[PDB]
Amino acid sequence: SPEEEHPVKAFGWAARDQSGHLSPFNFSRRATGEEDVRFKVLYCGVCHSDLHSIKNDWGFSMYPLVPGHEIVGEVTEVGSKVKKVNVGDKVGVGCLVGACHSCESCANDLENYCPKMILTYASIYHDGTITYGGYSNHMVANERYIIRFPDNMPLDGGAPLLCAGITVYSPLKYFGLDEPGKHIGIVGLGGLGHVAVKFAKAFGSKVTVISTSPSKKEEALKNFGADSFLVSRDQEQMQAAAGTLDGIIDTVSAVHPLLPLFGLLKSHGKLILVGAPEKPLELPAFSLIAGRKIVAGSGIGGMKETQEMIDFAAKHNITADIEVISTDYLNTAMERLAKNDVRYRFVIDVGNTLAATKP
């Protein structure tokens, strides 16, 4: 049973089937190994991936499932061989908790592209046990997967950077879209989306937000500093912005038309997909052939870059626009997320509200 699997008792909220209903769940975590860092969870951002997972949208879900991979907390214990962290330090854990550490990808700081990468939740750890996420009281992870939180970085506002942040920061850098002056488009002004605008602006790029929500126009332009706001619903407005973007970061969580997006790209432009739709997208061959355009994918980021990303965010005072919620509000929050009703990221105040939900 989950409660007896490991020596240290743990408590959190989990889903038991694809209805995705979350409720109190008792389990356990391994003892602190020599290279392990144990910490009390203070905050955990809510990623749409969490929603996809509890609902089994991708079909890769095993239950019971404890989601959450934008975890921030305070160190309570460290193994005898830990070097970069001390008890009391503020740390975080993203989407990864392990990898093989013996392949070219891992050697090149790309644990995220390791064929044996281990996800923070819904995966199998090196000890053969299921991984449980951040919607819980405490966490333990190997030092290589521990992110050191900057002193000038709010614990709640910076939590989403652990997944949303690195996921958009990584491709902007890798695909050479972080050049000042370049025109970058962001599709879907949601969790990853609004954070992507912030990073793009910090890199000095001109940003165009492509959205299905006219109500987000003022916030996109006046608060996030987007240079242009396009409603994908408006074919008229889209055509007027034809061939204006050097690259696009698409964060849409559902199947959506790609044709219009390629139209916004300049010759040789790049469309980067980071959203994880449940089903395949439509790709018009002509959209790529005419202008030698590219469509690529990107997943989170390696551990080294994740730390570099949070260090950059702290220097540029970048944080997510969050709505802090109590643990018992999780099911309502999940429905609001499904209905595009959050501006722009939910963050669970685990440290102050989880304990009270114990039956």
Place this chain on the structure above:
Amino acid sequence: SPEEEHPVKAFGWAARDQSGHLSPFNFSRRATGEEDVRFKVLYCGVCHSDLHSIKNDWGFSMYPLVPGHEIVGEVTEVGSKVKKVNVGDKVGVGCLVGACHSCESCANDLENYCPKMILTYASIYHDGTITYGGYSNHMVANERYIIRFPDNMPLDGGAPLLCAGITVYSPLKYFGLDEPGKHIGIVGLGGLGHVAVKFAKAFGSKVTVISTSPSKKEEALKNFGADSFLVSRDQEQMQAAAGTLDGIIDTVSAVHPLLPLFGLLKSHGKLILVGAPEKPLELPAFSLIAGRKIVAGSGIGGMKETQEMIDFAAKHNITADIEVISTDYLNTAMERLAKNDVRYRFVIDVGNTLAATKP
């Protein structure tokens, strides 16, 4: 009318509607300008694009339509300003006959990606008249679009290189798939596909052919030098070749599964689409995200590279494997091409059979 539009009478075969039925057609071409090169058409390869066009598969077809853009012939007249071409020289014309010549793309020898590029047929020329292709008695084109044919290359066997050849040569070079030690896959062993294998091997790469025709195995391995032949519908064979390719050149002219192709690619692999299916392809976001893979498109090539391509082909004794046909066999040939019944490129013997079809 086509016959009165220009001063020089011309004769060829054209389609009048989406049925694609080809028959004798009288038209005309402009007088030889100061920078123009006029030549008698000796051969014209039959590209599947010709088939797509006459059947109006893409919807951009204007009728009457004279296809053909793998044109080879002998110069009969040259303008006073022509610098490198002389009467009697063997020359060729590919998919392009013009561009703006005042933009960045043109300046970078990429007339093919110029927004005002002018296709050899079914386009509008600088004088506002419709362009007619190589299924005709003679051709006239500005010197910048004239390819100088190498002395050691057959006029018929080399004709297909003008479109099929440059189209596969360009991406191999551009996406860095032209190096020994690289394992490349070619999807669809047809007109473009078989020439692609030849160039790939000439570059020194290891080549895997992915086909739906098992009868093509022997020719692929024995004649073209492919190192591996995979039947795309054989899941077991495809599975065993998982993650072995650095890149893939997809020439398929119809909708086909991309998921299996992504499976063959190594991490960070590139899938290059050159085939032009009318309907959209299915693109699973996870196929790109898991491994940071790319799908790109490529169209023919610029004039500078087209000349470099044919020179490279001549140096390596590369030619298309053709079936020479008489002009009056065109409708039967189009039916066979539609049914994937040619090994591997039809080439019209215009110089010896076109005139005979004049009533």
